[PDB]
Design a protein around this ligand. Structure first.
Ligand code: PC1
Ligand code: PC1
Ligand code: 3PE
Ligand code: 3PE
Ligand code: SF4
Ligand code: SF4
Ligand code: SF4
Lengths: 360, 115, 171, 156, 68, 178, 80, 318
């Protein structure tokens, strides 16, 4: 029952998204990104939006930036709940999954209230966001956030010090810092083993450079350390949500360049130029200036990136997606050396892999 | 006769449930349905090939420890003896020897699974 | 009931016959489990109790370990059952019929002797202390803690030395 | 009334038994698996309707095909469908399975699971919300209810 | 609410009470209104068999006292 | 800014009280008992489930569901063959074949939506310049047969008629945001 | 060894308990007034018949009737 | 009449197991903040019946590579053994009064494992082999200490008969004299029934399903029926040995009812644990037992040999 070799065969969920995108305009490709990591949607579409904004040489408005950071943190909470609870369910413990999926449903309710879809919102659009927060959503977010801490603390009182959990994780999937860097790991696959890296701090995007949050780092480098790291990341996400709620500013929500973002419907209905802009935007789309870029974000799993090459048309020329988990599932073998089948089942969870992103 | 009757009744009940389960359901037998199961993909190899047991040493040690259990199981009737001192000394020696064997095996890494 | 014990002994003989024919070790273990059960029943019917139950327990444990070993080492792509090999099947039937005929022959040549099918079941138990209390085989066995301590010493030493011997054979 | 009344109530009983304990199979392919998880979650507890996930295809009843079905994955889906024991049903969930979905015009996507296995209920959406999936499961229960296998056998 | 759990538990409690009560009642019924005499030793077996022969009905539970 | 999550700090502190506490922890299963207590505490809390069939959960006016084609109060299909809906639909689920009318009006003669290809993205309802195509509140339109999921102009218009009230309310309550 | 014992007490309490209980199992039987009474009680329990012995006229201690004062007396067991 | 007693002992036990399934589902749901089965019949009472009918009406698979003889025999053996073990239990009067009832229980429980072993080997499937050889290790773990624990506790009872424990606990529970052993025995029952945190022979997460992967329909249902009956049985054995009910020769009904109360309590605790704890690994289980319970178990057996002597409290025989 000892694992002598791991040969991850993937591609069972590959649907040629990278080639499909090349045939669709820049607005028509955004929904794909919400499906690349179906667990953390808005962060993927945030990566796309930042990349396209970089190429367009335009800047999102302040309220849109704050909203994007807020919903990015909510998405990070969603991803961490999924990772931790599915990991626990596969290891054996089952109750925390049911406990926490109620809060996942509440966060989905926020998702739907803002975007009209419980996931795959397509809310974040190159230029800012599609629509402004419906009144009261901040109040509901406050009500949810003020209590989420107690629920995470209950999950911790279940799992943190339990001898069974500690024996089932500790000193499992131990990866050295140099080996991780060479293997190309990212996110918690790096911070767990002592490496002090987090793009939100090192290379900030949006308004991550105006909110204070700590970055948990692990010492042992094993599954238990990384589970603790994810829980602490959830707590820091609550911190950031508090700050965003308190500092949400007034103003527009989408770049006020009607050649990039659609004009408001009333303007479309009473302005000639605005109607022309609506027509061309929703038919031909924007014309992104030629160039190439590699935008990176600290997606709830790791470092979600887009290498985008544009030739001046309204459709991208090439859109490679660097999924955080690709290198992780590549390094599964190294991590699983000298472990049993159960340990391997544990090891796969720490990676927190979504094969939507793995396969692209 | 009572124990035989009740055990045969249990056997008959179980066997009757099995026969009903095999003759009541409507069936459709075909090769793909019948072929073995392995997470949706065909077997890379048959399951009859050697399967290394990484706890062989502990498994054997179980034999001897179970025979020690056998040697000890008469104690409830033994204590009804007149030579209580002798019985006590013998049982203590036996259990202490058991403990020493286990301790030596532990210190010699017998219980650590073989990789 | 008259034929109770003789039937049990014959079943023991058949189980032992299968084991001797030596199918795959899995079927060998199954056959020995059945044989151990039947032997425990014979001992129980002969007034025993603790001894029969002990044999059954120890043999269940032994065959458990044996099965674990067989799955790992004593295995084949196509394990052979009793019926798979035509020679094994034929000699199984031959042995059964041969024992039947041998029983008949011994009964005929010695009307009363090794076998007394007529008068069977009339000599199972010989004597019993009708009004006794302390006559249970567990007492005799427990005697090892008082009157036969030499037996205990030798057996305990055997197990103790077995620990070291096994470890060093498997080193 | 008549003996055929006994037959009618007997297949009513069979249908009740089958519908009140349809164990789905753990087979989440893509996004839509998350929504099936939310179905199981406390709010819309599927268990309350007797629905419980069991991993063994030999021990499952309904197959909830949820997510993109690529050419690579098609053989495995068909294998498991063939392996499920007889009184089996198939519910397709999500656009990816109902039809091609967002990846209809792709080289490595089976344009719908109907091509590979017979589908008894289609649940539209992308994702179909958990309430929608629960309604679809109830609709499958109604379909089971309207069976009449034994009456067909008698009138055979 | 947790009260809705308790119907199944009540069914269980009944179903597990029946075995013991039924056994006691039936043992008493079939052994002359007295609990079944356990024979854990040849002495007890001999006493029971003596009662069986003495009773005259071939029944061990039928008791003959000073009158006989 | 970083915080250690599991770094062992000062080690020399060994005490008789500490040692007996640790031995009690190991032998008595204290943390396991505590987890069991947590589970019981949950046992005695109001369930979070809802009797779904007779109690649907909340949905906001923006919810995207089954499509519909609206009408003017006079009773006329708003569909003017913009064709932008068909141009923008990322999954290419809309098919429009339009012809001039007998009234000298622009209308559509084949409006088909493949609801097995739609991704429920709302791009059509937001690129419709006369608010013809909308995504109504309905989310329960599962069908047994695939062909019943290939919609047509008729089925869409009947859905519009059926859901006109709720579509009207949502549009009324949301148009300010749009 | 105070240091090693104190550490063992916390890091391997199971073995500390086992060795302590084994040590007590040996020590206590030697240190206990009641130990002598076990064999006396088991000798008091009368499993077999007490065989009468023919009176040759010079057996002065064994009684003639069970209720006679002579003979072993289980007062010690009665008030152990 | 003896047949009527057999019926009264079997049918209620099987129904109690059937509803143990429902109770487990509902308790887990409530502890997890959901309601569990409550639509099939009033308050979900009919869920076990619907499940059993569905399972026995589903087609029983007979995979090609399997060995039919063992693949059919094993479930029968499982159910037969689980039902049989209920035979000698005093409640308070056993249906069958066996002098060595405890050894009979041990023999039957040990033979129980062969159902799993043979089913797994006969499936001729890799996950089946994994499950069977994990069950082997599970047995190698618990069986070493189960016998010693029973010996130590019975060292206050004086004979292997179960009924004697009724009198033993006449004025007190045996729990108090041997609470250290009660806990080890409880964990041993948890392992023996192959239930969480020790459900490693059918662990869904690691092996799609263990020994029972290829089993389907009624042949499958027998395995679970035996599993749950065994849960009830083992908790009944705990209730009789430790946690002795109140026995007064005047009313056996008191013993019966109190035994029911305590057995339900412990059976509920099994599900409590299932929902509360993760799953051991199948080497951690063996390490746990051998290197924690056995060192303590041997010492406790030594101490309980000493106790009757140096306290002059020898148990009576008979
Ligand atoms: C206490 C709970 C546990 C109880 C477990 C026992 C369950 C008892 C269930 C009672 C209902 C008994 C009828 C079950 C029928 C199940 C199989 C079936 O539906 O076959 C239909 C069959 C269908 O008839 P058919 O053969 O003409 O159907 C067409 C066949 N093919 C597909 C091949 C063309 O009818 C029968 O003959 C069944 C007779 C049952 C008596
Ligand atoms: C126990 C008996 C052991 C002593 C020897 C038995 C001698 C008589 C055996 C007769 C031949 C049986 C045989 O061929 O094996 C075939 C089978 C193997 O069959 P199979 O796995 O190859 O599948 C057969 C498939 N068909 C039907 C298509 C041919 O093995 C057995 O029969 C042994 C089963 C055990 C029987 C005892 C049950 C006791 C209850 C459990 C305790
Ligand atoms: C007066 C003179 C005589 C004096 C004699 C004194 C004797 C004192 C005896 C005290 C010892 C009591 C017995 C305790 C047995 C426990 C053994 C133990 O120490 O724990 C081992 C294990 C803990 O895990 P671990 O950290 O690995 O321990 C070894 C560390 N090297 O522990 C475990 O196995 C836990 C993992 C399994 C968890 C199973 C879930 C159980 C849930 C709680 C059950 C609680 C109720 C149990 C009681 C039931 C009663 C019917
Ligand atoms: C699909 C295959 C199914 C196989 C099922 C097999 C079930 C086996 C159950 C495990 C049995 C193993 C233990 C050995 C049998 C029981 C031994 C026993 O408990 O004692 C039997 C008893 C004799 O002793 P006893 O009565 O207790 O004391 C004397 C004063 N009364 O009284 C007796 O002598 C009765 C002896 C018969 C015991 C039952 C035999 C069952 C045979 C089934 C075939
Ligand atoms: S239908 Fe939509 S939500 Fe479901 S798997 Fe496909 S893309 Fe994901
Ligand atoms: S749906 Fe709207 S945009 Fe499309 S043709 Fe109709 S009116 Fe024009
Ligand atoms: S919602 Fe999106 S995918 Fe669906 S029809 Fe409208 S534009 Fe097309």
């Amino acid at each position: 029952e000892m694992v002598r070799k791991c040969d991850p065969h993937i591609g069972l969920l590959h649907r040629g998204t990278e080639k499909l995108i090349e045939y669709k305009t820049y607005l028509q490709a955004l929904p794909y990104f919400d499906r690349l990591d179906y667990v953390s949607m808005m962060c993927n579409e945030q990566a796309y939006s930042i990349a396209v904004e970089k190429l367009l040489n335009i800047q999102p408005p302040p309220r849109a930036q704050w909203i994007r950071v807020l919903f990015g943190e909510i998405t990070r909470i969603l991803n961490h709940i999924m990772a931790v609870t599915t990991h626990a369910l596969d290891i054996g413990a089952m109750t925390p999954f049911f406990w926490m999926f109620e809060e996942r449903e509440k966060m989905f309710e926020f998702y739907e209230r803002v975007s009209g879809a419980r996931m795959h919102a397509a809310y974040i659009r190159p230029g800012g966001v599609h629509q402004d927060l419906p009144l009261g959503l901040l109040d509901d977010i406050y009500e949810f956030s003020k209590n989420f801490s107690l629920r995470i603390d209950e999950v911790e009182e279940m799992l943190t010090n339990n001898r069974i959990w500690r024996n089932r994780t500790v000193d499992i999937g131990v990866v050295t810092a140099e080996d991780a860097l060479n293997y190309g790991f990212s996110g918690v696959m790096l911070r767990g083993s002592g490496i002090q890296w987090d793009l939100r701090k090192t290379q900030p995007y949006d308004v991550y450079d105006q909110v204070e949050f700590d970055v948990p780092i692990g010492s042992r480098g094993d599954c238990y350390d990384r589970y603790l790291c994810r829980v602490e990341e959830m707590r820091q996400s609550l911190r950031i949500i508090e700050q965003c709620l308190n500092k949400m500013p007034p103003g527009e929500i989408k770049v006020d360049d009607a050649k990039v973002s659609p004009p408001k419907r009333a303007e479309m209905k009473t302005s000639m130029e605005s109607l022309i802009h609506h027509f061309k935007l929703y038919t031909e789309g924007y014309q992104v200036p030629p160039g190439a870029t590699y935008t990176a974000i600290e997606a709830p799993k790791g470092e979600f990136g887009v290498y985008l090459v544009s030739d001046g048309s309204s459709r991208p020329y090439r859109c490679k997606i660097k999924a955080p988990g690709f290198a992780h599932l590549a390094g599964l073998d190294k991590m699983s050396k000298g472990h049993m089948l159960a340990d391997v089942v544990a090891i796969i969870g720490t990676q927190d892999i979504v094969f939507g992103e793995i396969d692209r | 006769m009572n124990l035989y009757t009740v055990i045969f009744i249990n056997i008959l009940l179980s066997l009757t449930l099995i026969l009903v389960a095999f003759w009541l359901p409507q069936m459709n037998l075909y090769s793909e349905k019948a072929n073995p199961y392995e997470c949706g993909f065909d077997p890379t190899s048959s399951a009859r090939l050697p399967f290394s047991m990484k706890f062989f040493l502990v498994a054997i040690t179980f034999l001897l420890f179970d025979l020690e259990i056998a040697l000890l199981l008469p104690l409830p009737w033994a204590i009804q003896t007149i030579k209580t001192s002798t019985m006590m000394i013998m049982a203590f020696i036996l259990v202490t020897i058991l403990s020493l064997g286990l301790a030596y095996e532990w210190t010699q890494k017998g219980l650590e699974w073989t990789e | 009931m008259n034929n109770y014990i003789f039937v049990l002994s014959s079943l023991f003989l058949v189980g032992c016959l299968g084991l001797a024919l030596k199918p795959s070790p899995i079927y060998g273990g199954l056959g020995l489990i059945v044989s151990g059960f039947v032997g425990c029943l014979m001992v129980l019917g002969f007034g025993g109790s603790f001894l029969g139950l002990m044999v059954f327990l120890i043999y269940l444990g032994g065959m458990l370990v044996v099965f674990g070993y067989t799955t790992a080492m004593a295995t084949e792509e196509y394990p052979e059952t009793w019926g798979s090999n035509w020679l094994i099947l034929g000699f199984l039937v031959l042995g059964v019929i041969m024992e039947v005929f041998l029983i008949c022959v011994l009964n005929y040549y010695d009307e009363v002797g090794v076998i007394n099918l007529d008068g069977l079941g009339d000599w199972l138990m010989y004597e019993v202390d009708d009004v006794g209390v302390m006559l249970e085989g567990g007492i005799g066995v427990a005697a090892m803690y008082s009157c036969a301590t030499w037996m205990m010493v030798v057996a305990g030493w055997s197990l103790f030395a077995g620990i070291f011997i096994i470890i060093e054979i498997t080193r | 009334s008549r003996a055929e009344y006994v037959v009618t109530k007997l297949d009513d009983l069979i249908n009740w038994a089958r519908r009140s304990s349809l164990w789905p199979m753990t087979f989440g392919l893509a996004c839509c698996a998350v929504e099936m998880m939310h179905m199981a979650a406390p709010r819309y507890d599927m268990d309350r309707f007797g629905v419980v996930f069991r991993a063994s295809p030999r021990q499952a009843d309904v197959m909830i095909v949820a997510g993109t079905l690529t050419n690579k994955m098609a053989p495995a889906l068909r294998k498991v469908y063939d392996q499920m024991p007889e009184p089996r049903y198939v519910v397709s969930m999500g656009s990816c399975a109902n039809g091609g979905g967002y990846y209809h015009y792709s080289y490595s996507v089976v344009r719908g699971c109907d091509r590979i296995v017979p589908v008894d209920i289609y649940v539209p959406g992308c994702p179909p919300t958990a309430e929608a999936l629960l309604y679809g499961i109830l609709q499958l229960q109604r379909k089971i209810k309207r069976e009449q296998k034994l009456k067909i056998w008698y009138r055979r | 609410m947790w009260f809705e759990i308790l119907p199944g538990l009540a069914i269980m409690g009944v179903c597990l009470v029946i075995p013991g009560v039924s056994t006691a009642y039936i043992h008493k019924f079939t052994n002359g209104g007295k609990e079944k005499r356990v024979a854990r030793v040849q002495y007890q077996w001999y006493l029971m068999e003596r009662d069986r022969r003495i009773s005259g009905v071939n029944r061990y539970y039928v008791s003959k006292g000073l009158e006989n | 800014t970083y915080k250690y999550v599991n770094k062992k700090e000062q080690e020399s502190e060994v005490d008789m009280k500490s040692a007996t506490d640790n031995a009690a922890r190991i032998l008595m299963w204290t943390e396991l008992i505590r987890g069991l207590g947590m589970t019981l505490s949950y046992l005695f809390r109001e369930p979070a489930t809802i009797n779904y069939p007779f109690e649907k959960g909340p949905l906001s006016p923006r919810f995207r569901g089954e499509h519909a084609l609206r009408r003017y109060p006079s009773g006329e299909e708003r569909c003017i063959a913009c064709k932008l809906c068909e141009a923008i639909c990322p999954a290419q689920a809309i098919t429009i074949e339009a012809e001039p009318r007998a009234d000298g009006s622009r209308r559509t003669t084949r409006y088909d939506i493949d609801m097995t290809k739609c991704i429920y993205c709302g791009f059509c309802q937001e690129a419709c310049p006369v608010d013809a195509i909308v995504e109504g509140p309905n989310f329960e339109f599962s069908t047994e047969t695939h062909e019943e999921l290939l919609y047509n102009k008729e089925k869409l218009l009947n859905n519009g008629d059926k859901w006109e009230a709720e579509i009207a309310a949502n549009i009324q309550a949301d148009y300010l945001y749009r | 060894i105070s240091a090693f014992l104190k550490n063992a007490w916390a890091k391997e309490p199971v073995l500390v308990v086992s060795f302590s209980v084994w040590g007590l199992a040996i020590i206590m039987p030697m240190i206990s007034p009641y130990t002598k009474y076990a064999s006396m009680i088991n000798k008091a329990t009368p499993y077999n018949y007490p065989v009468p012995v023919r009176d040759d006229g010079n057996m002065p201690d064994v009684p003639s009737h069970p209720q006679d004062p002579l003979g072993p007396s289980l007062d010690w067991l009665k008030n152990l | 009449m003896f047949f009527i007693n057999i019926l009264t002992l079997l049918v209620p036990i099987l129904i109690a197991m059937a509803f143990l399934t429902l109770v487990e589902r509902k308790i887990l749901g409530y502890m997890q903040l959901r309601k569990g089965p409550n639509i099939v019949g009033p308050y979900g009472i009919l869920q076990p019946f619907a499940d059993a009918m569905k399972l026995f009406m589903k087609e029983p698979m007979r995979p090609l590579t399997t060995s039919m003889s063992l693949f059919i025999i094993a479930p029968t053996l499982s159910l037969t053994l689980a039902l049989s073990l209920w035979v000698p239990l005093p409640m308070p009067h056993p249906l069958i009064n066996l002098n060595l009832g405890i050894l009979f229980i041990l023999a039957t429980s040990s033979l129980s494992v062969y159902s799993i072993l043979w089913s797994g080997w006969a499936s001729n499937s890799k996950y089946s082999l994994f499950g069977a050889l994990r069950a082997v290790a599970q047995t190698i773990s618990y069986e070493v200490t189960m016998a010693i624990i029973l010996l130590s506790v019975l060292l206050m009872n004086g004979s292997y008969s179960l009924q004697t424990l009724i009198t033993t606990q006449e004025h007190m529970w045996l729990l108090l004299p041997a609470w250290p052993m009660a806990m080890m025995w409880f964990i041993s029952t948890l392992a023996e029934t192959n239930r969480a945190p020790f459900d490693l022979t059918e662990g869904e997460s690691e092996l799609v399903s263990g020994f029972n992967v290829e089993y389907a329909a009624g042949p499958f249902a027998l395995f679970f029926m035996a599993e749950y009956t065994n849960i009830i049985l083992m908790n009944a054995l705990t209730t009789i040995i430790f946690l002795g009910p109140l026995y007064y020769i005047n009313l056996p009904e008191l013993y019966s009812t109190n035994f029911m109360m305590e057995a339900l309590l412990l059976s509920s605790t099994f599900l409590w644990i299932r929902a509360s704890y993760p799953r051991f690994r199948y080497d951690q289980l063996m390490h746990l037992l051998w290197k924690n319970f056995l060192p303590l178990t041997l010492a406790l057996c030594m101490w309980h040999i000493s106790l009757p002597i140096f306290t002059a409290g020898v148990p009576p025989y008979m």
